[PDB]
Design a protein around this ligand. Structure first.
Ligand code: CLA
Ligand code: CLA
Ligand code: CLA
Ligand code: CLA
Ligand code: CLA
Ligand code: CLA
Ligand code: CLA
Ligand SMILES: CCCCCCCCCCCCCCCCCC(=O)OC[C@H](CO[C@@H]1O[C@H](CO)[C@H](O)[C@H](O)[C@H]1O)OC(=O)CCCCCCCCCCCCCCCCC
Ligand SMILES: CC1=C(/C=C/C(C)=C/C=C/C(C)=C/C=C/C=C(C)/C=C/C=C(C)/C=C/C2=C(C)CCCC2(C)C)C(C)(C)CCC1
Ligand SMILES: CC1=C(/C=C/C(C)=C/C=C/C(C)=C/C=C/C=C(C)/C=C/C=C(C)/C=C/C2=C(C)CCCC2(C)C)C(C)(C)CCC1
Ligand SMILES: CC1=C(C/C=C(\C)CCC[C@H](C)CCC[C@H](C)CCCC(C)C)C(=O)c2ccccc2C1=O
Ligand code: SF4
Ligand code: SF4
Lengths: 86, 257, 126, 89, 74, 132, 617
């Protein structure tokens, strides 16, 4: 499961949420940005690692970071379509 | 048909897919609240009666106008299914996530897919066509149904109450500890998983190491079975003067800030 | 003759050494793939690795080492963590912004706590 | 008999002189194979030792030798460090 | 009272990882709320690799520069 | 009291500064701080706040006076120069080998003392700068 | 079990020896045990060579006529041979100087070789025994004192087996005696001794005793320098590994150079193929070791270094200057070397070879004449002729060697540029500011920020290994053509046609492939058939590396998905294979890049080895 993290620099764009093809990122209330909302990743197990969320983050560097973990691949992380491991 | 599909059941072909995933991939596990972020988040429960497994549905009225394709999921070769339940306002054409085209029903609609990515792509397409209440479910091997996507009822693009932040790190991305600083710890290869306290502590520790004018010698252990070496340096006096130096240095540093 | 020697030994061994040995190696590697200890040291959370970690912890807590070791928890190195925090508290009170309501122990709890359920050692219900 | 290939083999006229006999007979080859079998047994032992790693009790339950005690105490031979460095000094 | 750099004033970025580190940018607006961690919104002539030239910075990550104490030639 | 983000950053700075100034002393006890790893050896600080080498950097001859080290390095330099000159150019020893006779051990032993003189004069200046 | 993917293989096999990640045997005792096992493998490999040389080989016939006999490596018993090929082939000939080494170190019989094989097997058993019991006690073994003692013992062996040892009067029993008595076994004549056309065994023994004694003294001096100023501030297995690898690469490259120019094995220069293979092999090994030193330096930066105001911190702070200046050096060298070569190509093509830009290597000629040569060959710097010159195999340089050395400098500087750039950007670039938290090797950072392909620090080595192979190819072409011209007595075809690159094609590659390609044809097959076959095999491996490097994953993952669909829809097999066991997935990006590089370099090495054999046969 590719770990995905959210940092203080997030400004509540919701672009990372809209860019996720597997509904990993999620908008929680917070008191750190003017938008009063901050991205969170409660469904990292569905993260394929495509880094579309990083392509849509407007901050100077990625307020959302996807750390690929090749030693912990999952059928959800590998995007398996014809093989089931459950 | 035996040449079209294998004659054995999906469970028979699966063998011990479970009890081997727990061995082959012991890391692959879901957290205690998979679709949600906090334990006290309603956690709406659905059963097979609401969203049945696809092998139990034949010519269901809720299926869209789909002609079948080779790009669907692997029946009898995979057991995990993802289902979409969305309600239409009119009967129009849409692209299946597995290529090909289907036509939505006037009312309720229901599709089955293998990967959640296909379901999310279809949800994006439908919401682009002004469709609400797109609910995405997951079908397990034994038939347990997990409700996903608008897990708390509100789409993730819109902030909603009761959603605890997850994987939120209270600093900038480059304020993570370096791997060398987190060496010999559980976070050596994964500094992004360290606590804020741990990262700050190691970032202060590296600075402490680079001040050998005040760093403490940390005397050698007494491992040999013989008598203690008389030496020529008093560790007690050094410890006392190091306590004094630490006190004065902390006082000066706090005066600076 | 010159040919004899390596001819007979070769006719015995080269079939063995190539066919039998390589085929046995391939088959045993396929078996090792389906073995429970398949790359156990490099698969996170594997049963053998977790049992080894538990036994290492048990040996460390049963046979203390006179020499100082690298702390698995960086804060566990402190000989008196109580004194560490007490000093912090004193320094923070010295440089607290006015009558701030924020205390040191609450801040340490806030920094130490972290919600990363998807990180392993947390997905193993640990 | 060989068909020579390459300009230098023909030019220099080097001949591959086959020895009249073999060179190792058969008994000494058998002795070499026996010694290699012993080496193979030792290699199997080493492979079993390394694959399962070092058990946690050894180096923790077995007390260090006085040489090892004094070396760790005084920081010698790569101790007081985290490196191997066979060419230490 | 106003806290942070003045609107429209050139500031030098002190954030080590920022694409415009030690470079210069114009302050668009500073959020006058104590809870905002990165209120100082700075606009730069150069766009980063994401083709975005506006970012918010913390109060301690920007150095306000006087009208003639910086280098006009970058 | 509606803690500010700047107040949180101030606490982070205070924590980092306090930790940094606290882990230096004998209250952290990490393998790095063990003698012969990062620290300066117990009773022998090599340099102080100013980066000036102390007499402890010389080791066994940490209390040999500056005058004695100057004499040692000058004598070693003179003897080594004499040995090198008598080995290479004046009465060359390789040419003596070509004559079938052995080397002259005096020349080799003398010429061995030039790096001795080098490190000896470096140590001599270290002692002189420390007032020894 | 085994409900993983095929990606598990290439994911773990890429780190299967990354023992720092292997928590079980993570202690340094285990790493020393790995060293013991590796040395046991080396001993068994040397035992292999000695056993097959003494079993089916002509060493007893080699010592008698080292110039007129071709050394035999092992007996060939391939069942695929046709009776003619069986009658054609005698045995696998020798491409290594083990016959020469055994002759030099005093082997005079196959019985001695057999005892050597037994001793090698017993020593491998000893190494395995030592590896059985890792222990801080065994960590004491080693050190520069130990290797210097090994050198002293080797000096003793060479003294015992020097050709003049028979005339030696026993020093330890009858005293040192006259100087000539010691000269029977210890000499410093210098250079080739004529006859054997190699350094005297007395010279080598004397060298080794001197080196061992000096090494003991140097180790003692280094340890007293550790007495005062005792600072092991940065200990890392990768830092020490980088030190060892860089020193070993320097030593191996120096070995290649000084073993060609000062051969130490008797009757080695008479064997052209073994000399060329020796030089090429050792230069490749040295370049690989230097590249490994840089790689492990990068790894130490990635996951073992803590930023400080030290040497490495200073290097990192001004890494932009280092990378920019290295880029300037590489750009200048490449621009000028390529431009001069193209100018010479145009001049030679246009029938005007005089108008080529031939910059005389006057600096290297000055060094050679003033410091090395004993006769006036060029006359610059000095013209004195030595009354009693010594012999060696130092080549005489000319105009083309200037351009070739500039190509070598370009290759070395570009390799260093890539390696240093990757290692120093492992700490982060403005495209990837947080590379310190991503590990040494990773695929990419995605298509965002314009693209981040090959941004990993491991990808820096992946890119620089092509340059390593290219630089080694350049200077090994240089060495091979130089020695081919010297042996074929041309020495003017090289000096004129190496100025332009069409010469490097026509006279070197196209010319020296004539006999190799005729290894087998319609007429028949000769002893070079195996090398033509290996030539083709190496080209095939190189182009498969091209496949793995050019085409990337996604395509192949979709294709493999369709193949899985075919299998799951196939009759008689969907009942048996559900793709759940070892799921076939495409190679990961890092795995694909490494496998493509591996095929590329395997084809590289095998192609050049086959070409060298077919050219210098
Ligand atoms: C690097 C080691 C090595 C290699 C590659 C070879 C290669 C070869 N040997 Mg051989 N051999 C070796 C060492 C080696 N030998 C040693 C040390 C001995 C002394 C016991 C022998 C004794 C020997 C005999 C008696 C015969 C061969 C034969 C052969 C040929 C056919 C293969 C075979 O049947 O092997 C059989 C070899 C053995 C049974 C001996 C075991 C080999 C050593 C001890 C193991 C070395 C392993 C090494 C450390 C690498 C391990 C890692 C690996 C997994 C990658 C082939 C050319 C045959 C031949 O010429 O027929 C045409 C034959 O009849 N060998
Ligand atoms: C076991 C050690 C050993 C032995 C037996 C020899 C023996 C020899 N060496 Mg020799 N050498 C050695 C170590 C040794 N060397 C080392 C370690 C080096 C490198 C520093 C050299 C460098 C060297 C050179 C450069 C030359 C020789 C030469 C010679 C030969 C001439 C004899 C002579 O003049 O000796 C010297 C006699 C002495 C009594 C010198 C004693 C020096 C003392 C022991 C130093 C220690 C003093 C102590 C600190 C107080 C002779 C065969 C010559 C030769 O063969 O020419 C063809 C020659 O040119 N040697
Ligand atoms: C004594 C020297 C030495 C030592 C101890 C190490 C040790 C290590 N290296 Mg290292 N390295 C070295 C030299 C050394 N290296 C050199 C010289 C280079 C430059 C070439 C490198 C380049 C290098 C890289 C780039 C990396 C390492 C890594 C590592 C670590 C993991 C090794 C691993 O699992 O690889 C796995 C080993 C393999 C997969 C071996 C490949 C098998 C080969 C290719 C087979 C092909 C040959 C085939 C038979 C030919 C067929 C021919 C055909 C015609 C048939 C480990 C600590 C890794 C690391 O630390 O990352 C965190 C890493 O990424 N090393
Ligand atoms: C660097 C030191 C060194 C090395 C590598 C060698 C290497 C060798 N010597 Mg040797 N030798 C040395 C020092 C050395 N010698 C010294 C100092 C002397 C003078 C006392 C001699 C005197 C000597 C003689 C008189 C002979 C050799 C021979 C040999 C060869 C075969 C020996 C063998 O394996 O079978 C013998 C050993 C065994 C069967 C078992 C090995 C011994 C133990 C078990 C392993 C050692 C472990 C290691 C130290 C770690 C081999 C090339 C023989 C030969 O034919 O060479 C031309 C031979 O007849 N040596
Ligand atoms: C491991 C170290 C080692 C060992 C064990 C030996 C062993 C031996 N050396 Mg020797 N030697 C060595 C290193 C060593 N050497 C080195 C490094 C040098 C260079 C200085 C020499 C130079 C040397 C000479 C010049 C002579 C010996 C001689 C001898 C022999 C002594 C007489 C005898 O056979 O008694 C039982 C014996 C075989 C004598 C002899 O007769 O050997 C042929 C002799 O005259 N050695
Ligand atoms: C023939 C193939 C080839 C060529 C020419 C180059 C050329 C270059 N590579 Mg390169 N590379 C190659 C294959 C090649 N690579 C392969 C296969 C790989 C493996 C992936 C790499 C991996 C690689 C890396 C990883 C790096 C390079 C770098 C470089 C540059 C080094 C600086 C230099 O020499 O400038 C000289 C430039 C040339 C020779 C290009 C040709 C220019 C003209 C045509 C020749 C001169 C004509 C004349 C003088 C100009 C006329 C001027 C006026 C009259 C108009 C250079 C542009 C390094 C770099 O960019 O640093 C600056 C670097 O980091 N390369
Ligand atoms: C970065 C530039 C660079 C590099 C890396 C090298 C590298 C090398 N050169 Mg070289 N060379 C260069 C530029 C360079 N050259 C230039 C510009 C010229 C003038 C045409 C030469 C002329 C030259 C000759 C004649 C010889 C070498 C040789 C060599 C090799 C041996 C080392 C040596 O002699 O150092 C030489 C290094 C220098 C002289 C330093 C040059 C570095 C400067 C900074 C580059 C710019 C110089 C500038 C244009 C001069 C302006 C002059 C003007 C003010 C009057 C080595 C591969 C030798 C060789 O081929 O061995 C076989 C040899 O004999 N070089
Ligand atoms: C003639 C010999 C020349 C040919 C050998 C040249 C090989 C170049 C030397 C470089 C070797 C070190 C590279 C390395 O280990 O990392 C190269 C990579 C490093 O490993 C990668 O690490 C990454 C994170 O660091 C990810 O985990 C990747 O999944 C993992 O593959 O290893 C692999 O890609 C291994 C895949 C191929 C394994 C096949 C085994 C072949 C055995 C047959 C014998
Ligand atoms: C020598 C030696 C060694 C090695 C070993 C090895 C390395 C082995 C391997 C082995 C192997 C690796 C084997 C393999 C095999 C394979 C096979 C045997 C296959 C076959 C196949 C076939 C026969 C068929 C083919 C085909 C097809 C399929 C199609 C196309 C056509 C054809 C027909 C061709 C060592 C060092 C260890 C030690 C001892 C000695
Ligand atoms: C990445 C990195 C790293 C690594 C590094 C390295 C890897 C290095 C190497 C280095 C090296 C590898 C070096 C080398 C050197 C060498 C030398 C220094 C030599 C010299 C010599 C000379 C100079 C001489 C010359 C000559 C001759 C001999 C002849 C001719 C003439 C003349 C005189 C010229 C580290 C981590 C650590 C740090 C950080 C970064
Ligand atoms: C061809 C190709 C493939 C397909 C190649 C694969 C899947 C590997 C080929 C496997 C070979 C054919 C061996 C197959 C299995 C053998 C039976 C050996 C099994 C060994 C195990 C038991 C260890 C990729 O996956 C790929 C990925 C990324 C970039 C480029 C490419 C690429 O070019
Ligand atoms: S796109 Fe980036 S800044 Fe915007 S909400 Fe998502 S993570 Fe935060
Ligand atoms: S990498 Fe892709 S799947 Fe993973 S969180 Fe980002 S957008 Fe979602």
């Amino acid at each position: 499961a590719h770990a995905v993290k959210i940092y203080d620099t997030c400004i509540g764009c919701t672009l990372c949420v809209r860019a996720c093809p597997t509904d990993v990122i999620e908008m929680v209330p917070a008191t750190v940005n003017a938008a009063k909302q901050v991205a969170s990743t409660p469904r990292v197990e569905d993260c394929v690692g495509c880094k579309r969320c990083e392509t849509a983050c407007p901050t100077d560097f990625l307020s959302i970071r996807v750390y690929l973990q090749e030693n912990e691949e999952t059928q959800y992380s590998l995007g398996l379509d014809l093989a089931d491991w459950s | 048909a035996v040449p079209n599909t294998p004659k054995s059941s999906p469970d028979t072909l699966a063998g011990n897919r479970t009890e081997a995933s727990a061995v082959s991939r012991p890391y692959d596990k879901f957290n205690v609240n998979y679709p949600l972020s906090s334990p006290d988040q309603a956690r709406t429960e659905v059963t097979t009666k609401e969203i049945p497994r696809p092998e139990d549905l034949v010519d269901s009225p809720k299926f869209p106008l789909f002609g079948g394709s080779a790009n669907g999921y692997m029946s009898k070769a995979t057991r995990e299914r993802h289902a979409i339940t969305w309600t239409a306002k009119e009967e129009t054409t849409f692209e299946m996530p597995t290529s090909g085209w289907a036509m939505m029903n006037k009312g309720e609609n229901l599709c089955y897919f293998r990967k959640k990515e296909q379901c999310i792509a279809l949800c994006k397409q439908l919401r682009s066509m002004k469709i609400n209440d797109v609910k995405i479910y997951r079908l397990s091997k034994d038939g347990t149904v997990t409700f996903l996507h608008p897990s708390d009822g509100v789409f993730p693009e819109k902030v909603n109450k009761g959603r605890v932040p997850v994987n939120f790190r209270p600093f900038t991305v480059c304020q993570n500890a370096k791997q060398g600083e987190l060496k010999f710890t559980e976070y050596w290869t994964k500094p992004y998983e360290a606590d804020a306290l741990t990262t700050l502590f190691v970032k202060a520790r590296v600075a402490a190491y680079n001040d050998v004018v005040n760093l403490f010698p940390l005397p050698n252990p007494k491992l040999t079975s013989g008598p203690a070496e008389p030496t020529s340096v008093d560790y007690d006096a050094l410890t006392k003067e190091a306590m004094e130096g630490q006190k004065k240095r902390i006082e000066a540093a706090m005066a600076s800030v | 003759a010159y040919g004899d020697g390596p001819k007979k030994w070769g006719a015995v061994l080269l079939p063995l050494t190539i066919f039998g040995v390589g085929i046995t190696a391939m088959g045993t590697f396929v078996l090792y793939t389906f073995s429970e200890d398949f790359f156990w040291a490099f698969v996170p959370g594997s049963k053998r690795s977790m049992e080894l970690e538990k036994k290492k912890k048990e040996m460390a807590e049963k046979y203390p080492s006179p020499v100082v070791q690298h702390p698995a928890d960086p804060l566990a190195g402190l000989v008196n963590r109580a004194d560490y925090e007490k000093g912090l508290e004193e320094a923070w009170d010295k440089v607290k912004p006015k009558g701030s309501t924020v205390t040191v122990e609450e801040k340490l709890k806030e920094l130490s706590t972290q919600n990363n359920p998807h990180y392993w050692r947390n997905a193993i219900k640990s | 008999e060989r068909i020579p290939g390459g300009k230098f083999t023909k030019a220099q006229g080097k001949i591959v002189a086959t020895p009249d006999e073999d060179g190792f007979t058969d008994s000494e080859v058998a002795l070499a194979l026996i010694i290699a079998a012993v080496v193979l047994y030792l290699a199997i032992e080493v492979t079993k030792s390394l694959f399962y790693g070092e058990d946690p009790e050894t180096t923790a339950k077995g007390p260090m030798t006085p040489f090892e005690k004094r070396v760790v105490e005084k920081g010698l031979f790569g101790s007081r460090g985290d490196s191997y460095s066979p060419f230490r000094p | 009272a106003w806290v942070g750099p003045k609107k429209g004033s050139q500031v030098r970025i002190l954030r080590p990882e920022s694409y415009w580190f030690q470079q210069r940018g114009t302050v668009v607006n500073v959020n006058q709320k104590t809870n905002i961690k990165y209120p100082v919104t700075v606009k730069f002539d150069f766009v980063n690799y994401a083709n975005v030239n506006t970012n918010g910075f913390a109060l301690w990550e920007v150095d306000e520069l006087k009208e003639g104490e910086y280098d006009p030639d970058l | 009291y509606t803690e500010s983000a700047q107040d949180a950053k101030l606490f982070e700075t205070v924590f980092s500064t306090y930790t940094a100034e606290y882990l230096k002393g004998p209250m952290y006890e990490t393998p790095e701080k063990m003698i012969g790893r990062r620290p300066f050896n117990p009773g022998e600080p090599l340099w102080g706040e100013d980066k000036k080498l102390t007499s402890n950097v010389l080791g066994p001859l940490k209390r040999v006076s500056s005058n004695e080290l100057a004499f040692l390095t000058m004598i070693c330099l003179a003897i080594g120069a004499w040995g090198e000159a008598q080995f290479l150019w004046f009465d060359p020893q390789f040419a003596a080998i070509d004559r079938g006779e052995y080397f002259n051990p005096i020349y080799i032993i003398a010429a061995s003392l030039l790096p001795v003189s080098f490190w000896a004069h470096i140590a001599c200046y270290i002692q002189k700068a420390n007032g020894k | 079990y085994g409900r993983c993917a095929t990606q598990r293989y290439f994911q773990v096999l890429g780190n299967i020896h990354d023992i720092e990640l292997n928590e079980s045997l993570n202690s340094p005792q285990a790493i020393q045990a790995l060293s013991f096992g590796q040395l046991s493998v080396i001993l068994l490999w040397l035992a292999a060579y000695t056993f097959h040389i003494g079993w089916s080989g002509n060493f007893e016939a080699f010592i008698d006529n080292p110039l007129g006999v071709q050394p035999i490596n092992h007996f060939v018993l391939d069942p695929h041979y046709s009776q003619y090929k069986v009658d054609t082939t005698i045995a696998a000939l020798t491409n290594h100087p083990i016959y020469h080494w055994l002759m030099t170190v005093g082997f005079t019989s196959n019985a001695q070789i057999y005892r050597f094989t037994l001793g090698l097997e017993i020593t491998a058993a000893v190494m395995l025994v030592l590896s059985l019991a890792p222990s801080v006690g065994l960590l004491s073994m080693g050190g520069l004192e130990v290797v210097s003692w090994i050198s002293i013992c080797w000096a003793g062996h060479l003294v015992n087996f020097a050709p003049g040892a028979a005339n030696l009067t026993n020093v330890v029993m009858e005293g040192p005696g006259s100087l000539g008595n010691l000269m029977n076994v210890l000499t410093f004549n210098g250079g080739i001794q004529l006859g054997t056309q190699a350094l005297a065994v007395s010279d080598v023994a004397h060298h080794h005793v001197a080196i061992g004694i000096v090494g003991l003294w140097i180790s003692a001096l280094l340890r007293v320098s550790k007495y005062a100023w005792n600072f092991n501030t940065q200990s890392s297995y990768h830092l020490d590994l980088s030190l060892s690898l860089t020193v070993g690469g320097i030593l191996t490259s120096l070995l290649a150079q000084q073993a060609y120019v000062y051969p130490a094995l008797s009757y080695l220069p008479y064997d052209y193929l073994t000399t060329t293979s020796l030089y090429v092999h050792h230069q490749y090994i040295g370049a690989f070791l230097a590249t490994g030193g840089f790689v492990h330096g990068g790894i130490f930066l990635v996951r073992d270094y803590t930023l400080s105001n030290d040497l490495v911190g200073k290097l990192l702070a001004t890494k932009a200057t280092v990378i920019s200046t290295l880029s300037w050096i590489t750009l200048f060298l490449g621009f000028h070397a390529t431009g001069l070569y193209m100018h010479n190509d145009a001049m030679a093509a246009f029938g005007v070879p005089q108008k080529q830009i031939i910059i005389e290597p006057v600096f290297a000629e000055f060094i050679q004449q003033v410091f090395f040569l004993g006769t006036p060959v060029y006359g610059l710097g000095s013209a004195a002729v030595s009354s009693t010159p010594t012999l060696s195999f130092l080549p005489i340089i000319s105009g083309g060697d200037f351009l070739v050395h500039h190509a070598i400098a370009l290759g070395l500087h570009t390799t260093v540029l890539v390696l240093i750039k990757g290692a120093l950007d492992s700490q982060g670039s403005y495209l990837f500011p947080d590379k310190q938290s991503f590990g040494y090797g990773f695929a990419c950072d995605g298509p965002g920020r314009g693209g981040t392909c090959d941004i990993s620090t491991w990808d820096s080595f992946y890119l620089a290994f092509f340059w390593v192979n290219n630089t080694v190819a350049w200077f090994t072409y240089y060495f091979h053509w130089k020695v081919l011209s010297l042996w074929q007595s041309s020495t003017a075809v090289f000096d004129e046609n190496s100025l332009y690159l069409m010469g490097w094609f026509r006279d070197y590659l196209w010319q020296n492939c004539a006999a190799l390609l005729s290894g087998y044809d319609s007429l028949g097959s000769n002893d070079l058939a195996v090398w033509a076959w290996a030539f083709l095999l190496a080209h095939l491996a190189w182009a498969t590396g091209f496949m793995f490097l050019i085409s990337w994953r996604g395509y192949w993952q979709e294709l493999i998905d369709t193949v899985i669909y075919m299998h799951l829809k196939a009759p008689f097999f969907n009942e048996i294979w559900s793709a759940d066991v070892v799921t076939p997935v495409a190679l990961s990006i890092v795995q694909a890049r490494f496998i493509g590089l591996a095929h590329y370099v395997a084809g590289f090495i095998l192609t050049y080895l086959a070409f060298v054999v077919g050219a210098t046969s």
